[PDB]
Design a protein around this ligand. Structure first.
Ligand SMILES: O=C(/N=c1/[nH]cc(Br)s1)NS(=O)(=O)c1cccc(Cl)c1
Ligand SMILES: O=C(/N=c1/[nH]cc(Br)s1)NS(=O)(=O)c1cccc(Cl)c1
Ligand SMILES: O=C(/N=c1/[nH]cc(Br)s1)NS(=O)(=O)c1cccc(Cl)c1
Ligand SMILES: O=C(/N=c1/[nH]cc(Br)s1)NS(=O)(=O)c1cccc(Cl)c1
Lengths: 317, 319, 317, 317
């Protein structure tokens, strides 16, 4: 039987006998994603160019509006907003969502794949909601995922039941389930990082990469892929296996990427898919945050590859 | 005024008082590219998943381009990455142009939603003889027109001709290519390098040193950033937009590189040069190589002239 | 607040504290309507004309398959099928659905508006599901409506809460709520029927139509519109007021329109809009059917006009 | 061999060895139509209804700006504008274009089919361009036709070579040629007019219609259809045969439909497809306009139908 994202969320919902609040939130987000996809693919661009005589802002506005009006959220953290948004009393629900509405967008000039990253938490207690409700480790995530706007638009959604991939059929505006209960490869053949900054690498990253290009065990060198758009690189890592790194270098002791709405959601997907995600010192999902916009170093991917990185990291102490 | 691919080509076609054969061919190419875009974006996939309840994308793309160009009445010889021999347009349908194309480059990785693209190169038929494969064995310098469609976050057609490089965005709401960047030029010098470093162990000594300089400059400037989508169209378009360098060079294991000359390297080299950039095999100009085999490979280094020169410096230092 | 069909239905569903079955059915139906729309609008027609080297049947398959896989239905009556379809046991839910997957497709050659009409009942007994479960008077309906594939695609949904119209935004495949709680005008200015067949008219219809064209007082005669496509004429009757007629006569004593999946859901929509629908002898919604494909006469629309028609009808009784 | 509007026009443009100016006019009109089609199908309506927190006017702007920018036109007349628009000198071309950018749009509240109608003349006078330039009889037309935004969008183009029908495939934004060298039936079985004006009909019309309902030879009575939107009524007349009438009445002593951009284009299409269009007095195409917004009575369709009507017009002087 054909399955759609809306249908799959409603049946998972009916199974868990929940109130429907998580379904309303996910459906609202699904609508936002289709709106973002439409804009990203430049639908209606001819009007801008004067046929009848911003994108990251629109993306944020779309996600903000869709979630507020969902009556399922109370606290919203976005890459585009210095402070958490507190949902007005009347539209309040029990969920905290942290999102990146259009990751990769500063490089949209070249039509690079971009994406939307999201993670959903249950609010902490009865206390009037505040920014603190967002300061939660990944381990608390109820659901997470992303929409990649690549050659086609795909939504990846991870929850307790696992990871499922839905392709947007733009002819009908519907996410079709194409990959069920997906699991990452145990070990891959591709590593992904910005090698351009080799100079600043932690000695362990240097040795790990060296092991990829010159294995001392006669096996084939890994290929390298690095798009520079996190959703794109993480998606390829999920689909093909391998390793993706944005490591802590001595000048950036906490990485570049953001914990709340890039690192945590991706780590949740990875683990739900049977891969791993570490900062080097600990599981990404175990980091306890003190700032909504704080950074984290991150290495994720196939378990065999991330265990191999960790083993090297342990050696260098 | 608002300009569209078709408006642009008819406009240029009139300025030069041509027959309209090249215009008819581009129009057809544009129709096939919208159809490839639609399918790449997975419109109608719900039916394949049994919503009511065929072809692989590379095959469909090939059939779309072949069939559009044939029926254009503007072509006589078609070479595709997908077909071993040149296709010889049947006589009733024959025109004066030779097209070499890769109908869906980068498709071997379409499983992870990577940016894919269509690449094309157009030649005037030289000789007087019945058309044949040999007509496609023209050096890059003979190209009347070339470019590519990139099916990325959005769809863009890049069209290069004698008058420069023009970038058209597809508005899928109306199915028009909108001219959004006129007469494009690449930066003299960029801050990105693009190649598969995974295969460093097989690098040409010259490639190894060039890359080491990018990562640890001797003049202590800031090191370049690295990017490699692994899809040529995407890597070459970024090169064109942010400047820098893209490499797919020869080594011992592949003395002639991996990328194809007629339908990948030539068209991208032509684009690069019309945008005032540089494309080299290391020993000669990509555009100057005389082909002997329609599917022959070429090493390619292309991008900002200052990066390409700097690579040649290092390549010369190693003979 | 922006509202969609999915969000609307989940909202009305949580208010009523129902299980979700109705909502899964409406979501499935809505997905089918999007697919019918895309095909009606000829998306992908270039492939059939050879760019690379049934519509009534497809519309039927889309609805049948989406409804079957909704888990919300047990008996399906279609214009297109001789007998009722009984959903296999693993898939059985509580609703009986009666539909016309592509009303008006008869004249789709001239690109006249076509539509999808549906009516939803609850199965009444715990008997094994059979055709008989579809033999309910329209008073028994839980939901009814239609999709109109016209200049735009619109979904009109009637429930106890009233009639709501949703406009499909094809950019994103969401039906947007555009008219809340619609009511028909008390009296209209438009009469709609096939006047070409006047020689066969009942003498009551003849006189009623004669009075529309030749008022006894000094009032404006009525204008006339007849698309010949039932969804289009009914939707116009809904928005502008007036009367639509496909009445009985000597040659066709039970009219020509089908009761289960044409007259009943239009009668329902009309009555929820504060309008009327009669056979001439009784309300359409009170007819007890004995055959799934039985015909009914229908005269519907503004209450003042239908009451007037009934006045004239009775004069010839 | 698949054919598209742009390709067909180029092929035709090359045969006749023309300069390409008309091809640029037509391509520009084709682009305008796709943009109107997309607005009429309400793409991006979600943004108007607050998802991120006038159509005849837009249809007019699209057609005007596309025509102006084509360099192929000098004088433009539009249903929407009081006076002829005189193209600025730097953009001037040789063609005069009369159009109704969105016909039937007054009833679009009910999602009735709408359309775009155009007629194209070569400028005949050597005077500076002015309104007079648009005042030629329809006999002078070089090309005419319409787009019908029905259940799908079709462009109908009529020129010297006859009438051709193109279906818009909105997946790729290309009009695909679907019916070549179209001919209307010699005699039809449907008549089309607003019978609500029966009180104002002159005796010839009244008699003609009587015959359609009560044939004096015991052939089958005609069916009646009247969408009330001219493009739809005329397209059906084209596709199925029969007759479409809009005679004069007390509100419209000179008739209702506009001669320049409603009656001429349709008459031209009708004549090229082997049909007829009359005012009762003379061919619509032979009427010599004096005002750009002047109206005309029109009776058009199958030849044997218009001939039968003209006989009855004769019998009443
Ligand atoms: O969807 C829910 N409940 C429902 N009941 C009926 C319908 Br239709 S949806 N509940 S939940 O939102 O809390 C939930 C629980 C688990 C998984 C999901 Cl994805 C959603
Ligand atoms: O289009 C051409 N001529 C025309 N005549 C009328 C029209 Br409309 S187009 N000629 S060409 O195809 O040979 C040509 C020449 C130069 C540039 C282009 Cl891109 C196309
Ligand atoms: O949807 C229902 N309940 C729900 N619980 C949670 C979600 Br999310 S929907 N109930 S119902 O399907 O029975 C129903 C009841 C009344 C109206 C509607 Cl249109 C739907
Ligand atoms: O198109 C024209 N000429 C051309 N030359 C090359 C191309 Br490509 S089009 N001429 S025309 O515009 O005047 C013309 C003539 C007859 C029919 C048409 Cl529809 C168009």
């Amino acid at each position: 039987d054909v399955n759609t994202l809306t249908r799959f969320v409603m049946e998972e919902g009916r199974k868990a006998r929940g109130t429907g609040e998580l379904t309303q939130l996910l459906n609202s987000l699904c609508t936002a994603v289709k709106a973002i996809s439409s804009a990203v693919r430049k639908a209606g661009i001819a009007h801008l160019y004067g046929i009848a005589g911003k994108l990251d802002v629109l993306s944020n506005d779309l996600v903000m509006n869709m979630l507020k009006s969902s009556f399922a959220t109370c606290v919203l953290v976005s890459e585009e907003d210095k402070h958490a948004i507190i949902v007005e009393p009347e539209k309040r629900g029990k969920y905290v969502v942290c999102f990146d509405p259009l990751d990769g967008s500063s490089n949209i000039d070249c039509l690079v794949s971009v994406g939307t990253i999201f993670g959903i938490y249950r609010k902490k207690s009865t206390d009037e909601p505040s920014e603190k409700d967002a300061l939660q480790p990944g381990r608390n995530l109820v659901a997470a995922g992303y929409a990649l706007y690549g050659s086609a638009t795909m939504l990846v959604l991870a929850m307790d039941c696992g990871v499922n991939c839905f392709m947007l059929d733009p002819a009908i505006g519907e996410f079709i389930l194409v990959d069920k209960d997906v699991k990452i490869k145990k070990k891959g053949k591709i590593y992904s990082l910005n090698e351009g900054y080799a100079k600043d690498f932690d000695p362990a990253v240097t040795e790990y990469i060296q092991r990829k290009k010159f294995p001392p065990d006669n096996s084939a060198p890994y290929g390298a892929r690095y798009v520079g758009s996190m959703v794109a690189d993480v998606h390829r890592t999920l689909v093909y296996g391998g390793i993706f790194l944005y490591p802590a270098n001595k000048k950036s002791p906490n990485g570049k990427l953001r914990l709340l709405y890039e690192c945590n959601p991706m780590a949740y997907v990875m683990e739900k898919a049977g891969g791993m995600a570490t900062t080097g010192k600990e599981a990404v999902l175990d980091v306890i945050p003190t700032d909504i916009h704080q950074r984290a170093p991150v290495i994720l991917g196939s378990p065999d590859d991330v265990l191999e990185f960790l083993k090297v990291y342990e050696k260098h102490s």
